[PDB]
Every structure is written in C-alpha cells, then in structure tokens.
C-alpha cells in the first residue's frame, strides 16, 4: 500500500588519523539501494539494488556531488558543535541525519521528515507541518534561529514534496517486482521440554518481506505477554526477515496456546497450534 524513502547519514570525527568518516545509506521501505563510504576506494554513490543500476551516469555523478557536499558540511558542523557544547578536540563525536518522505498507494505525498542528532541525542528536527523546527537543547536553539532567518524549512519542504516524492515514485515503478512484493512468512513451531511438567513452545516466522510483522501468543484466546520472549525482527541476509516468539507452558496444556501471525503478505492472519 503506502511506501517510504529514507536516507541515513553518519559522520564520526577521528581525532587520531584523518578527517571524519562519512557513511550514507538509502532505503526504499526495508530495501537498501544506495551507499556512500568516505573510506571506500570508490569515492562515489554506489548501487546496492539491481533496479537502481538502470539509472544514467548523470544520476551517479549528481548523487556523488551531493554526498561530497554532505560530508564537507558534516565535517564543518562537527567543529561547530564542539564549540557549542564546549568540548575538547581529543574526543570522537557523531552527527546523524535522517530525511525522506512517505507516499500513499496512489503515489500522493503523505509525510516529509528531517531529523538531526549529536552523539545519538536529538539536536534539531523539522515538525510534521514542515514550517517550524524543534530544538532539543540551548545549543540547538542557536541553529534554529540561523535556519529561521534563512527560511530553511521552506527549502527542505520544496525537496520533501518535490524531488524526494518524484524519486520515490520513479524507484517504485523501476523496482516493482521486488518493491511492490509481499513475501509471506514461512511459519513453523518447535516444542522443547525443560522438565516433565514444563515445556517451551516457539513460533517462527521466516523469509518475509516487508519487516513489519506481529507475533502474539494467546492462552484460551487471551493475549499472553507473561512468560513470553519476543526477539527483535532480524535480517536473514537475502533481503528477507526473521522473528520468533516463545512461551513456557505447563506440560499437557500445549493445545490451550495459539500464536497469531499478522503480515501484509498473508491473506488472513494465521493461528498456529501445537
């Protein structure tokens, strides 16, 4: 249905050897398609998906220019932030940036995002209305005033509601076979006794795309959060995801328990029983 394009930028200052390390990644939903690494011998925006390889050399030359300008600005902002927080040169610090857009099933703009961090803490963010900023601390207020004076929110909105949505729309058409797909999870259940009176029931979900999934254990049709372990959704490595949820049940009561699997790739949510 609805789709998203996100860009994740990381800049880490190296007080030791050389200028800061800059890493940039691009996602279309849960699929990576572009990458830029300052340490890599390439020094260009590199393709990570087969459908992005159909873009012209002007696209790759443009995207590289943007990444060089992104890294140099990040290198300058690392120094600016050191002064703002009154920190020494010997310490290693990080700048993280997130921006992108959401489109509906029809391809219409839904949401635009612009968020910045310093040392994994909120610094400055553009609000949902895309007109105002949210400054986390006193140091961020200095940045906010500078950006209000230069009308930065309007320039960010023009990108988010323009080239960002236009780019995402193009990528979704170019990569329909892989991006519009809904790979359902391959569900199975394991039973392992810990004693003669206790047993572990584990419900699996493998090979699914997108990553969004719900695994809920029930006892007599009532949600079971107690005596349950739900691991974080993890990448399999082939563009697909994995997740499991286990519950410790008394021996003989196995059939009172059900696992409910919700995924957009499933026509009806599954109900598994041992």
């Amino acid at each position: 249905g609805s789709h998203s394009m996100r860009y994740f930028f990381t800049s880490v200052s190296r007080p030791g050897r050389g200028e800061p390390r800059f890493i940039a990644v691009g996602y279309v939903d849960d699929t990576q398609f572009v990458r830029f690494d300052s340490d890599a011998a390439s020094q260009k925006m590199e393709p990570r998906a087969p459908w992005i390889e159909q873009e012209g050399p002007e696209y790759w030359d443009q995207e590289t220019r943007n990444m060089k300008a992104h890294s140099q600005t990040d290198r300058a902002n690392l120094g600016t932030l050191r002064g703002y927080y009154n920190q020494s040169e010997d310490g290693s610090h990080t700048i993280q940036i997130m921006y992108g857009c959401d489109v509906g099933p029809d391809g219409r703009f839904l949401r635009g995002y612009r968020q910045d961090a310093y040392d994994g803490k909120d610094y400055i963010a553009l609000n949902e209305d895309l007109r105002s900023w949210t400054a986390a601390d006193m140091a961020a207020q200095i940045t906010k005033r500078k950006w209000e004076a230069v009308h930065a929110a309007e320039q960010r909105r023009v990108y988010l509601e323009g080239r960002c949505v236009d780019g995402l729309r193009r990528y979704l058409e170019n990569g329909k076979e892989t991006l519009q797909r809904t790979d359902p999870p391959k569900t199975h259940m394991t039973h392992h006794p810990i004693s003669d009176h206790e047993a572990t029931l584990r419900c699996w979900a493998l090979g699914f795309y997108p990553a969004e999934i719900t695994l809920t254990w029930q006892r007599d049709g009532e949600d079971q959060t107690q005596d349950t372990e739900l691991v974080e959704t993890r990448p399999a490595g082939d563009g697909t995801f994995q997740k499991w949820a286990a519950v410790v049940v008394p021996s003989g009561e196995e059939q009172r328990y059900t696992c409910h699997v919700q995924h957009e790739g499933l026509p009806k949510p599954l109900t598994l029983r041992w």
Partner: peptide, 9 residues
C-alpha cells in the same frame, strides 16, 4: 534522490 546541499549549524 538525495538533497543538493546540507545546512550549517
């Protein structure tokens, strides 16, 4: 596609 310029703090 990505932004052309990044703003200074």
């Amino acid at each position: 596609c990505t932004e052309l310029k990044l703003s200074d703090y």
